[PDB]
mmCIF file of C-alpha atoms and ligand atoms in Angstrom:
data_model
loop_
_atom_site.group_PDB
_atom_site.id
_atom_site.type_symbol
_atom_site.label_atom_id
_atom_site.label_comp_id
_atom_site.label_asym_id
_atom_site.label_seq_id
_atom_site.Cartn_x
_atom_site.Cartn_y
_atom_site.Cartn_z
ATOM 1 C CA UNK A 1 82.784 124.921 84.008
ATOM 2 C CA UNK A 2 82.147 126.422 80.582
ATOM 3 C CA UNK A 3 81.258 130.079 81.142
ATOM 4 C CA UNK A 4 79.008 132.229 78.902
ATOM 5 C CA UNK A 5 80.957 133.952 76.103
ATOM 6 C CA UNK A 6 78.283 136.658 75.807
ATOM 7 C CA UNK A 7 76.848 138.975 78.468
ATOM 8 C CA UNK A 8 73.371 140.539 78.320
ATOM 9 C CA UNK A 9 73.740 144.285 78.915
ATOM 10 C CA UNK A 10 70.478 145.724 77.605
ATOM 11 C CA UNK A 11 66.903 144.778 76.836
ATOM 12 C CA UNK A 12 64.200 146.678 74.964
ATOM 13 C CA UNK A 13 60.777 145.098 74.778
ATOM 14 C CA UNK A 14 58.112 146.364 72.431
ATOM 15 C CA UNK A 15 54.930 144.700 73.605
ATOM 16 C CA UNK A 16 51.357 144.671 72.415
ATOM 17 C CA UNK A 17 48.738 145.374 75.064
ATOM 18 C CA UNK A 18 47.054 142.351 76.597
ATOM 19 C CA UNK A 19 43.680 140.747 75.961
ATOM 20 C CA UNK A 20 40.966 143.368 75.603
ATOM 21 C CA UNK A 21 37.264 143.457 74.757
ATOM 22 C CA UNK A 22 36.492 144.106 71.075
ATOM 23 C CA UNK A 23 37.033 147.738 70.027
ATOM 24 C CA UNK A 24 33.623 147.974 68.347
ATOM 25 C CA UNK A 25 30.082 146.611 68.137
ATOM 26 C CA UNK A 26 28.700 147.847 64.819
ATOM 27 C CA UNK A 27 25.506 147.168 62.875
ATOM 28 C CA UNK A 28 27.532 145.392 60.182
ATOM 29 C CA UNK A 29 28.959 143.000 62.767
ATOM 30 C CA UNK A 30 25.449 141.908 63.732
ATOM 31 C CA UNK A 31 24.119 141.665 60.182
ATOM 32 C CA UNK A 32 26.732 139.091 59.085
ATOM 33 C CA UNK A 33 25.618 136.652 61.760
ATOM 34 C CA UNK A 34 22.200 135.538 63.043
ATOM 35 C CA UNK A 35 23.758 134.808 66.448
ATOM 36 C CA UNK A 36 24.336 137.221 69.333
ATOM 37 C CA UNK A 37 27.912 138.274 70.079
ATOM 38 C CA UNK A 38 28.951 137.427 73.659
ATOM 39 C CA UNK A 39 29.435 140.373 76.029
ATOM 40 C CA UNK A 40 32.662 141.344 77.786
ATOM 41 C CA UNK A 41 33.351 142.228 81.477
ATOM 42 C CA UNK A 42 34.994 145.543 80.542
ATOM 43 C CA UNK A 43 34.359 148.517 78.277
ATOM 44 C CA UNK A 44 35.086 148.177 74.569
ATOM 45 C CA UNK A 45 38.815 148.239 73.829
ATOM 46 C CA UNK A 46 39.726 148.062 77.522
ATOM 47 C CA UNK A 47 42.123 145.552 79.044
ATOM 48 C CA UNK A 48 40.370 142.730 80.890
ATOM 49 C CA UNK A 49 41.611 141.674 84.323
ATOM 50 C CA UNK A 50 42.474 138.339 82.694
ATOM 51 C CA UNK A 51 44.457 140.210 80.054
ATOM 52 C CA UNK A 52 46.298 141.937 82.881
ATOM 53 C CA UNK A 53 47.063 138.607 84.547
ATOM 54 C CA UNK A 54 48.415 137.144 81.304
ATOM 55 C CA UNK A 55 50.672 140.166 80.923
ATOM 56 C CA UNK A 56 51.756 139.834 84.565
ATOM 57 C CA UNK A 57 52.753 136.232 83.844
ATOM 58 C CA UNK A 58 55.136 137.406 81.118
ATOM 59 C CA UNK A 59 56.396 140.036 83.517
ATOM 60 C CA UNK A 60 57.008 137.282 86.072
ATOM 61 C CA UNK A 61 58.817 135.177 83.465
ATOM 62 C CA UNK A 62 61.001 138.040 82.233
ATOM 63 C CA UNK A 63 62.128 138.694 85.784
ATOM 64 C CA UNK A 64 63.234 135.073 86.272
ATOM 65 C CA UNK A 65 64.766 135.096 82.791
ATOM 66 C CA UNK A 66 66.671 138.337 83.348
ATOM 67 C CA UNK A 67 67.899 137.208 86.774
ATOM 68 C CA UNK A 68 69.408 134.068 85.222
ATOM 69 C CA UNK A 69 71.024 136.318 82.605
ATOM 70 C CA UNK A 70 72.344 138.454 85.455
ATOM 71 C CA UNK A 71 70.889 141.787 84.319
ATOM 72 C CA UNK A 72 68.422 142.110 87.220
ATOM 73 C CA UNK A 73 68.931 141.124 90.880
ATOM 74 C CA UNK A 74 66.997 138.120 92.176
ATOM 75 C CA UNK A 75 65.761 139.948 95.256
ATOM 76 C CA UNK A 76 64.321 143.374 95.949
ATOM 77 C CA UNK A 77 63.031 146.102 93.675
ATOM 78 C CA UNK A 78 65.164 146.949 90.678
ATOM 79 C CA UNK A 79 67.568 149.804 91.406
ATOM 80 C CA UNK A 80 66.371 153.324 90.611
ATOM 81 C CA UNK A 81 66.557 154.022 86.898
ATOM 82 C CA UNK A 82 67.280 150.398 86.013
ATOM 83 C CA UNK A 83 63.831 149.581 84.631
ATOM 84 C CA UNK A 84 61.778 151.977 82.507
ATOM 85 C CA UNK A 85 58.209 151.405 81.354
ATOM 86 C CA UNK A 86 56.609 153.560 78.678
ATOM 87 C CA UNK A 87 53.104 153.152 77.298
ATOM 88 C CA UNK A 88 50.809 154.663 74.711
ATOM 89 C CA UNK A 89 48.034 156.815 76.209
ATOM 90 C CA UNK A 90 45.361 154.151 75.764
ATOM 91 C CA UNK A 91 43.820 152.574 78.842
ATOM 92 C CA UNK A 92 44.802 149.145 77.527
ATOM 93 C CA UNK A 93 48.464 150.077 76.964
ATOM 94 C CA UNK A 94 48.758 151.951 80.263
ATOM 95 C CA UNK A 95 47.273 148.966 82.123
ATOM 96 C CA UNK A 96 49.566 146.577 80.239
ATOM 97 C CA UNK A 97 52.514 148.589 81.498
ATOM 98 C CA UNK A 98 51.161 148.262 85.043
ATOM 99 C CA UNK A 99 50.452 144.524 84.677
ATOM 100 C CA UNK A 100 53.999 143.908 83.417
ATOM 101 C CA UNK A 101 55.578 145.958 86.211
ATOM 102 C CA UNK A 102 53.506 144.164 88.834
ATOM 103 C CA UNK A 103 54.620 140.840 87.405
ATOM 104 C CA UNK A 104 58.244 141.885 86.962
ATOM 105 C CA UNK A 105 58.648 143.530 90.396
ATOM 106 C CA UNK A 106 55.633 142.907 92.684
ATOM 107 C CA UNK A 107 54.831 145.665 95.186
ATOM 108 C CA UNK A 108 57.629 147.804 93.743
ATOM 109 C CA UNK A 109 55.277 150.206 91.989
ATOM 110 C CA UNK A 110 57.434 150.847 88.934
ATOM 111 C CA UNK A 111 56.183 153.939 87.123
ATOM 112 C CA UNK A 112 54.459 153.604 83.767
ATOM 113 C CA UNK A 113 55.289 156.793 81.887
ATOM 114 C CA UNK A 114 53.176 158.129 79.044
ATOM 115 C CA UNK A 115 52.942 161.324 77.081
ATOM 116 C CA UNK A 116 51.734 164.085 79.444
ATOM 117 C CA UNK A 117 48.649 164.864 77.376
ATOM 118 C CA UNK A 118 46.649 161.613 77.432
ATOM 119 C CA UNK A 119 43.681 163.004 75.484
ATOM 120 C CA UNK A 120 45.827 163.608 72.400
ATOM 121 C CA UNK A 121 47.539 160.774 70.473
ATOM 122 C CA UNK A 122 51.219 159.951 71.042
ATOM 123 C CA UNK A 123 53.293 160.261 67.833
ATOM 124 C CA UNK A 124 55.789 157.731 69.168
ATOM 125 C CA UNK A 125 53.154 155.098 68.309
ATOM 126 C CA UNK A 126 52.179 156.505 64.881
ATOM 127 C CA UNK A 127 53.746 159.755 63.537
ATOM 128 C CA UNK A 128 51.230 159.786 60.679
ATOM 129 C CA UNK A 129 48.131 160.219 62.839
ATOM 130 C CA UNK A 130 49.507 163.403 64.455
ATOM 131 C CA UNK A 131 50.931 164.876 61.261
ATOM 132 C CA UNK A 132 54.619 164.570 62.099
ATOM 133 C CA UNK A 133 54.997 163.171 58.571
ATOM 134 C CA UNK A 134 52.909 161.977 55.616
ATOM 135 C CA UNK A 135 52.540 158.993 53.306
ATOM 136 C CA UNK A 136 53.261 159.216 49.596
ATOM 137 C CA UNK A 137 49.750 158.387 48.389
ATOM 138 C CA UNK A 138 50.540 157.243 44.867
ATOM 139 C CA UNK A 139 53.628 155.288 45.973
ATOM 140 C CA UNK A 140 51.809 153.639 48.890
ATOM 141 C CA UNK A 141 48.882 152.732 46.632
ATOM 142 C CA UNK A 142 51.259 151.070 44.163
ATOM 143 C CA UNK A 143 53.255 149.178 46.784
ATOM 144 C CA UNK A 144 50.187 147.744 48.554
ATOM 145 C CA UNK A 145 48.472 146.701 45.321
ATOM 146 C CA UNK A 146 51.753 145.220 44.126
ATOM 147 C CA UNK A 147 52.093 143.111 47.270
ATOM 148 C CA UNK A 148 48.405 142.222 46.816
ATOM 149 C CA UNK A 149 49.158 140.658 43.466
ATOM 150 C CA UNK A 150 47.822 143.564 41.452
ATOM 151 C CA UNK A 151 44.356 143.915 42.949
ATOM 152 C CA UNK A 152 42.493 143.260 46.177
ATOM 153 C CA UNK A 153 40.212 140.982 44.164
ATOM 154 C CA UNK A 154 42.982 138.535 43.315
ATOM 155 C CA UNK A 155 44.111 138.877 46.930
ATOM 156 C CA UNK A 156 40.722 137.819 48.356
ATOM 157 C CA UNK A 157 40.175 135.293 45.601
ATOM 158 C CA UNK A 158 43.219 133.459 46.893
ATOM 159 C CA UNK A 159 41.748 133.285 50.375
ATOM 160 C CA UNK A 160 38.176 132.209 49.674
ATOM 161 C CA UNK A 161 38.783 129.039 51.641
ATOM 162 C CA UNK A 162 39.535 131.159 54.694
ATOM 163 C CA UNK A 163 36.573 133.448 53.940
ATOM 164 C CA UNK A 164 34.116 130.553 53.605
ATOM 165 C CA UNK A 165 35.452 129.199 56.885
ATOM 166 C CA UNK A 166 34.620 132.533 58.531
ATOM 167 C CA UNK A 167 31.134 132.470 56.973
ATOM 168 C CA UNK A 168 30.680 128.963 58.367
ATOM 169 C CA UNK A 169 31.522 130.181 61.852
ATOM 170 C CA UNK A 170 29.165 133.160 61.419
ATOM 171 C CA UNK A 171 26.414 130.970 59.934
ATOM 172 C CA UNK A 172 26.539 133.779 57.430
ATOM 173 C CA UNK A 173 23.976 132.014 55.177
ATOM 174 C CA UNK A 174 21.223 132.711 57.733
ATOM 175 C CA UNK A 175 22.380 136.285 58.384
ATOM 176 C CA UNK A 176 20.480 139.488 57.729
ATOM 177 C CA UNK A 177 23.019 140.711 55.186
ATOM 178 C CA UNK A 178 22.577 137.426 53.339
ATOM 179 C CA UNK A 179 18.789 137.077 53.788
ATOM 180 C CA UNK A 180 17.873 140.644 52.765
ATOM 181 C CA UNK A 181 20.157 140.264 49.763
ATOM 182 C CA UNK A 182 18.621 141.860 46.666
ATOM 183 C CA UNK A 183 20.589 139.859 44.113
ATOM 184 C CA UNK A 184 19.646 136.449 45.494
ATOM 185 C CA UNK A 185 20.259 135.073 42.027
ATOM 186 C CA UNK A 186 23.706 134.203 43.394
ATOM 187 C CA UNK A 187 25.107 132.494 46.493
ATOM 188 C CA UNK A 188 25.890 134.523 49.623
ATOM 189 C CA UNK A 189 29.507 135.594 49.815
ATOM 190 C CA UNK A 190 31.213 137.957 52.239
ATOM 191 C CA UNK A 191 33.743 139.173 49.671
ATOM 192 C CA UNK A 192 30.947 139.706 47.160
ATOM 193 C CA UNK A 193 28.525 141.341 49.590
ATOM 194 C CA UNK A 194 31.287 143.635 50.878
ATOM 195 C CA UNK A 195 33.726 144.584 48.102
ATOM 196 C CA UNK A 196 37.076 145.627 49.570
ATOM 197 C CA UNK A 197 38.698 148.852 48.409
ATOM 198 C CA UNK A 198 42.083 150.353 49.187
ATOM 199 C CA UNK A 199 41.910 153.856 50.661
ATOM 200 C CA UNK A 200 45.174 155.798 50.960
ATOM 201 C CA UNK A 201 45.528 159.230 52.549
ATOM 202 C CA UNK A 202 48.430 161.359 53.767
ATOM 203 C CA UNK A 203 47.900 160.055 57.292
ATOM 204 C CA UNK A 204 46.235 156.686 56.898
ATOM 205 C CA UNK A 205 45.671 153.506 54.915
ATOM 206 C CA UNK A 206 42.716 151.173 55.140
ATOM 207 C CA UNK A 207 40.796 148.363 53.499
ATOM 208 C CA UNK A 208 37.030 148.627 53.367
ATOM 209 C CA UNK A 209 34.761 145.627 53.018
ATOM 210 C CA UNK A 210 35.188 141.985 53.931
ATOM 211 C CA UNK A 211 38.947 142.191 54.291
ATOM 212 C CA UNK A 212 38.845 144.532 57.280
ATOM 213 C CA UNK A 213 35.666 143.001 58.708
ATOM 214 C CA UNK A 214 37.169 139.521 58.437
ATOM 215 C CA UNK A 215 40.424 140.754 59.981
ATOM 216 C CA UNK A 216 38.522 142.249 62.929
ATOM 217 C CA UNK A 217 36.052 139.388 63.397
ATOM 218 C CA UNK A 218 38.723 136.686 63.481
ATOM 219 C CA UNK A 219 40.772 138.680 65.983
ATOM 220 C CA UNK A 220 37.632 138.838 68.163
ATOM 221 C CA UNK A 221 37.290 135.046 68.046
ATOM 222 C CA UNK A 222 40.898 134.757 69.258
ATOM 223 C CA UNK A 223 40.207 137.275 72.020
ATOM 224 C CA UNK A 224 37.225 135.217 73.236
ATOM 225 C CA UNK A 225 39.476 132.148 73.286
ATOM 226 C CA UNK A 226 42.283 133.929 75.154
ATOM 227 C CA UNK A 227 39.695 135.427 77.523
ATOM 228 C CA UNK A 228 38.501 131.945 78.418
ATOM 229 C CA UNK A 229 34.945 132.494 77.201
ATOM 230 C CA UNK A 230 32.838 129.265 77.041
ATOM 231 C CA UNK A 231 32.408 128.911 73.268
ATOM 232 C CA UNK A 232 34.368 131.316 71.016
ATOM 233 C CA UNK A 233 32.635 131.673 67.653
ATOM 234 C CA UNK A 234 29.487 130.103 69.098
ATOM 235 C CA UNK A 235 31.305 126.791 69.519
ATOM 236 C CA UNK A 236 31.980 126.468 65.776
ATOM 237 C CA UNK A 237 35.771 126.565 66.108
ATOM 238 C CA UNK A 238 36.903 123.078 67.054
ATOM 239 C CA UNK A 239 40.529 122.628 65.935
ATOM 240 C CA UNK A 240 43.904 124.305 65.398
ATOM 241 C CA UNK A 241 43.570 124.094 61.616
ATOM 242 C CA UNK A 242 40.404 126.191 61.826
ATOM 243 C CA UNK A 243 42.060 128.698 64.147
ATOM 244 C CA UNK A 244 44.890 129.207 61.685
ATOM 245 C CA UNK A 245 42.561 129.451 58.697
ATOM 246 C CA UNK A 246 40.513 132.131 60.423
ATOM 247 C CA UNK A 247 43.454 134.137 61.714
ATOM 248 C CA UNK A 248 45.146 134.022 58.324
ATOM 249 C CA UNK A 249 42.563 136.638 57.254
ATOM 250 C CA UNK A 250 43.823 138.814 60.132
ATOM 251 C CA UNK A 251 47.551 138.392 59.388
ATOM 252 C CA UNK A 252 46.793 138.964 55.713
ATOM 253 C CA UNK A 253 45.382 142.451 56.279
ATOM 254 C CA UNK A 254 48.366 143.315 58.438
ATOM 255 C CA UNK A 255 50.698 142.046 55.710
ATOM 256 C CA UNK A 256 49.182 144.575 53.324
ATOM 257 C CA UNK A 257 48.570 147.544 55.629
ATOM 258 C CA UNK A 258 51.169 147.287 58.370
ATOM 259 C CA UNK A 259 54.095 145.341 56.952
ATOM 260 C CA UNK A 260 54.329 147.097 53.581
ATOM 261 C CA UNK A 261 57.610 149.079 53.674
ATOM 262 C CA UNK A 262 56.039 152.251 52.222
ATOM 263 C CA UNK A 263 53.830 152.451 55.301
ATOM 264 C CA UNK A 264 55.911 150.536 57.865
ATOM 265 C CA UNK A 265 59.142 152.540 57.699
ATOM 266 C CA UNK A 266 57.365 155.843 58.263
ATOM 267 C CA UNK A 267 55.000 154.492 60.931
ATOM 268 C CA UNK A 268 57.834 152.840 62.891
ATOM 269 C CA UNK A 269 60.491 155.580 62.734
ATOM 270 C CA UNK A 270 59.811 157.074 66.158
ATOM 271 C CA UNK A 271 60.039 153.592 67.682
ATOM 272 C CA UNK A 272 63.070 152.663 65.604
ATOM 273 C CA UNK A 273 64.871 155.745 66.956
ATOM 274 C CA UNK A 274 63.919 155.005 70.580
ATOM 275 C CA UNK A 275 65.004 151.370 70.262
ATOM 276 C CA UNK A 276 68.371 152.165 68.700
ATOM 277 C CA UNK A 277 69.153 154.925 71.179
ATOM 278 C CA UNK A 278 68.146 152.661 74.093
ATOM 279 C CA UNK A 279 70.356 149.809 72.859
ATOM 280 C CA UNK A 280 73.345 151.967 71.981
ATOM 281 C CA UNK A 281 75.766 152.445 74.913
ATOM 282 C CA UNK A 282 75.580 155.990 76.308
ATOM 283 C CA UNK A 283 75.450 157.928 79.600
ATOM 284 C CA UNK A 284 71.997 158.022 81.283
ATOM 285 C CA UNK A 285 70.131 160.715 79.299
ATOM 286 C CA UNK A 286 66.704 161.233 77.714
ATOM 287 C CA UNK A 287 64.708 160.819 74.479
ATOM 288 C CA UNK A 288 61.419 161.818 76.149
ATOM 289 C CA UNK A 289 58.931 160.832 78.912
ATOM 290 C CA UNK A 290 61.130 161.822 81.850
ATOM 291 C CA UNK A 291 62.975 158.506 81.651
ATOM 292 C CA UNK A 292 66.749 158.011 81.599
ATOM 293 C CA UNK A 293 68.352 156.063 78.733
ATOM 294 C CA UNK A 294 70.416 154.004 78.387
ATOM 295 C CA UNK A 295 69.404 151.746 81.290
ATOM 296 C CA UNK A 296 69.052 147.947 81.593
ATOM 297 C CA UNK A 297 65.444 147.241 80.639
ATOM 298 C CA UNK A 298 62.971 149.328 78.646
ATOM 299 C CA UNK A 299 59.408 148.045 78.237
ATOM 300 C CA UNK A 300 57.147 149.730 75.701
ATOM 301 C CA UNK A 301 53.410 149.087 75.725
ATOM 302 C CA UNK A 302 52.080 149.402 72.193
ATOM 303 C CA UNK A 303 49.908 147.709 69.605
ATOM 304 C CA UNK A 304 50.024 144.927 67.052
ATOM 305 C CA UNK A 305 50.422 147.529 64.318
ATOM 306 C CA UNK A 306 53.731 148.594 65.893
ATOM 307 C CA UNK A 307 55.059 145.035 65.985
ATOM 308 C CA UNK A 308 54.109 144.585 62.313
ATOM 309 C CA UNK A 309 55.530 147.990 61.294
ATOM 310 C CA UNK A 310 58.823 147.151 62.984
ATOM 311 C CA UNK A 311 58.869 143.723 61.425
ATOM 312 C CA UNK A 312 58.276 145.219 57.994
ATOM 313 C CA UNK A 313 60.806 148.020 58.487
ATOM 314 C CA UNK A 314 63.511 145.707 59.875
ATOM 315 C CA UNK A 315 62.639 142.919 57.448
ATOM 316 C CA UNK A 316 61.837 140.481 60.266
ATOM 317 C CA UNK A 317 59.384 137.677 59.458
ATOM 318 C CA UNK A 318 57.919 135.090 61.788
ATOM 319 C CA UNK A 319 55.194 132.589 62.579
ATOM 320 C CA UNK A 320 54.437 131.655 66.173
ATOM 321 C CA UNK A 321 53.957 127.930 66.884
ATOM 322 C CA UNK A 322 50.739 127.485 68.858
ATOM 323 C CA UNK A 323 49.623 131.067 68.232
ATOM 324 C CA UNK A 324 47.616 131.845 65.056
ATOM 325 C CA UNK A 325 47.951 135.629 65.477
ATOM 326 C CA UNK A 326 51.439 136.811 64.392
ATOM 327 C CA UNK A 327 51.061 139.901 66.635
ATOM 328 C CA UNK A 328 49.085 138.416 69.571
ATOM 329 C CA UNK A 329 47.984 140.198 72.745
ATOM 330 C CA UNK A 330 50.990 140.441 75.031
ATOM 331 C CA UNK A 331 53.308 139.584 72.131
ATOM 332 C CA UNK A 332 56.832 140.959 72.648
ATOM 333 C CA UNK A 333 59.408 142.021 70.087
ATOM 334 C CA UNK A 334 62.561 141.588 72.175
ATOM 335 C CA UNK A 335 65.705 143.526 71.325
ATOM 336 C CA UNK A 336 68.828 142.660 73.279
ATOM 337 C CA UNK A 337 72.369 143.907 73.304
ATOM 338 C CA UNK A 338 74.945 141.313 74.324
ATOM 339 C CA UNK A 339 78.636 142.020 74.833
ATOM 340 C CA UNK A 340 81.227 139.449 73.766
ATOM 341 C CA UNK A 341 83.554 139.063 76.734
ATOM 342 C CA UNK A 342 86.433 137.942 74.521
ATOM 343 C CA UNK A 343 86.800 141.284 72.704
ATOM 344 C CA UNK A 344 84.100 143.534 74.203
ATOM 345 C CA UNK A 345 82.255 143.751 70.896
ATOM 346 C CA UNK A 346 78.544 144.638 70.898
ATOM 347 C CA UNK A 347 75.850 142.450 69.340
ATOM 348 C CA UNK A 348 72.067 142.673 68.945
ATOM 349 C CA UNK A 349 69.557 139.839 69.065
ATOM 350 C CA UNK A 350 65.892 140.051 68.156
ATOM 351 C CA UNK A 351 63.200 137.629 69.293
ATOM 352 C CA UNK A 352 59.443 137.450 69.485
ATOM 353 C CA UNK A 353 58.231 136.170 72.825
ATOM 354 C CA UNK A 354 54.585 135.206 73.207
ATOM 355 C CA UNK A 355 52.087 132.978 74.999
ATOM 356 C CA UNK A 356 50.545 130.254 72.842
ATOM 357 C CA UNK A 357 46.818 130.592 72.438
ATOM 358 C CA UNK A 358 46.477 127.647 74.840
ATOM 359 C CA UNK A 359 48.693 129.202 77.537
ATOM 360 C CA UNK A 360 46.332 132.172 77.361
ATOM 361 C CA UNK A 361 43.163 130.067 77.278
ATOM 362 C CA UNK A 362 44.386 127.979 80.228
ATOM 363 C CA UNK A 363 45.859 131.110 81.828
ATOM 364 C CA UNK A 364 48.979 129.034 82.470
ATOM 365 C CA UNK A 365 51.502 130.742 84.773
ATOM 366 C CA UNK A 366 54.913 131.232 83.189
ATOM 367 C CA UNK A 367 58.380 130.484 84.515
ATOM 368 C CA UNK A 368 61.744 129.148 83.408
ATOM 369 C CA UNK A 369 60.275 125.640 83.742
ATOM 370 C CA UNK A 370 57.176 126.627 81.777
ATOM 371 C CA UNK A 371 58.364 129.476 79.495
ATOM 372 C CA UNK A 372 56.194 131.258 76.924
ATOM 373 C CA UNK A 373 56.706 130.521 73.249
ATOM 374 C CA UNK A 374 59.793 132.135 71.758
ATOM 375 C CA UNK A 375 61.239 132.541 68.264
ATOM 376 C CA UNK A 376 64.716 133.891 67.552
ATOM 377 C CA UNK A 377 64.558 136.322 64.662
ATOM 378 C CA UNK A 378 67.151 137.040 62.009
ATOM 379 C CA UNK A 379 67.647 140.514 60.535
ATOM 380 C CA UNK A 380 67.444 139.738 56.806
ATOM 381 C CA UNK A 381 69.651 142.643 55.779
ATOM 382 C CA UNK A 382 72.429 142.044 58.313
ATOM 383 C CA UNK A 383 75.787 140.909 56.979
ATOM 384 C CA UNK A 384 78.046 141.068 60.044
ATOM 385 C CA UNK A 385 76.775 138.284 62.338
ATOM 386 C CA UNK A 386 78.380 136.478 65.273
ATOM 387 C CA UNK A 387 78.435 132.777 66.140
ATOM 388 C CA UNK A 388 74.978 132.919 67.757
ATOM 389 C CA UNK A 389 73.761 134.644 64.604
ATOM 390 C CA UNK A 390 73.284 138.027 66.269
ATOM 391 C CA UNK A 391 73.856 141.192 64.253
ATOM 392 C CA UNK A 392 76.678 143.560 65.226
ATOM 393 C CA UNK A 393 75.797 146.890 66.828
ATOM 394 C CA UNK A 394 77.192 148.638 63.771
ATOM 395 C CA UNK A 395 75.261 146.324 61.476
ATOM 396 C CA UNK A 396 72.006 146.865 63.348
ATOM 397 C CA UNK A 397 72.596 150.634 63.524
ATOM 398 C CA UNK A 398 73.104 150.659 59.768
ATOM 399 C CA UNK A 399 69.858 148.721 59.269
ATOM 400 C CA UNK A 400 67.928 151.141 61.511
ATOM 401 C CA UNK A 401 69.545 154.191 59.903
ATOM 402 C CA UNK A 402 68.505 153.118 56.395
ATOM 403 C CA UNK A 403 64.979 151.933 57.269
ATOM 404 C CA UNK A 404 63.883 154.996 59.252
ATOM 405 C CA UNK A 405 62.312 158.018 57.562
ATOM 406 C CA UNK A 406 63.986 161.130 59.037
ATOM 407 C CA UNK A 407 60.992 163.292 58.134
ATOM 408 C CA UNK A 408 59.038 161.054 60.551
ATOM 409 C CA UNK A 409 61.405 161.191 63.512
ATOM 410 C CA UNK A 410 60.131 163.038 66.587
HETATM 411 HG HG1 LIG B 501 56.949 160.107 83.612
HETATM 412 HG HG1 LIG B 502 69.989 159.057 75.941
HETATM 413 HG HG1 LIG B 503 68.724 151.660 77.522
HETATM 414 HG HG1 LIG B 504 46.060 141.266 66.471
#
């Protein structure tokens, strides 16, 4: 029988937390719609039990997947120091680490390690926020505007179709913001009512106005859908074309703020370093958290921003069939190191594993027979590839070494 020419020796998964309740409930959010936003079963920004289940499903699937690839045993708890789970200090990331462990190795109680001080932010997930390093204001301002086509105005102008679709779902025309409009000489418009400005600081970048509101609102509609709520968007979202149109406003903000190299490289350095060191063969040592690397499987519970920063820094681009959000809840950036049996050469493969919006909505259990969506990624700047199109260890290491910003390493 034909035998595999490659052998999986290491897996590093950077995952976004699972489905959570919206992070905010502001006055603006209520003024752009005459309707009442549905309530959630958990606290704002917290993981919902359903979100935990969905993550557990992926954990269940990865276990079956890894067993078939021979990296994890089919029975029993993984051997000590074989599986490592790290998570940002947030409740939602911590719980995602627990949901994955429970799904990967039920009743095994794998430890979810986090930074010791959980009341302070973890630089691993954003070195800017803690001051490890800073953004070049002028340079970042120029790069974002450049990618925006010169101005945020031209940027939004090109997405008015998506913006009017959002207004339709919000019944924005009968909203307070619209009704108490002073300049009613003109038609109600989200981009007009809320001009979007680019704000760049040493430790942060943001978009004010309709761009960020739209990006948040559309994500909330997706969350309702994934959460299984009766009628996401008050029942005004009836087809896949509408889902994509709405979410495009979300992916668009991430394109500008999280994918832009001038922000991405810096923001992803700590993770880039952890990933490379975890994938590079070495004797069981550390990098932080009281966890030994290298190992066999490393699961990192983070955020969508991290997935986008890594994509931008590694020059990885993707679209997920059946999933309008490019960095969906539970979404996994999978890094694997395979060894070519023929000559013992090392190769790295990158994928994006995720549950389609329907698999979330229907809470469909995952397995080898019913796997989650998956897209094999190609490192744009990698020259030395193998038959399967994987990048060589050396090639990948070169890519990581040039993308990272040393001043931002931990
Ligand atoms: Hg720990
Ligand atoms: Hg190490
Ligand atoms: Hg490792
Ligand atoms: Hg998102």
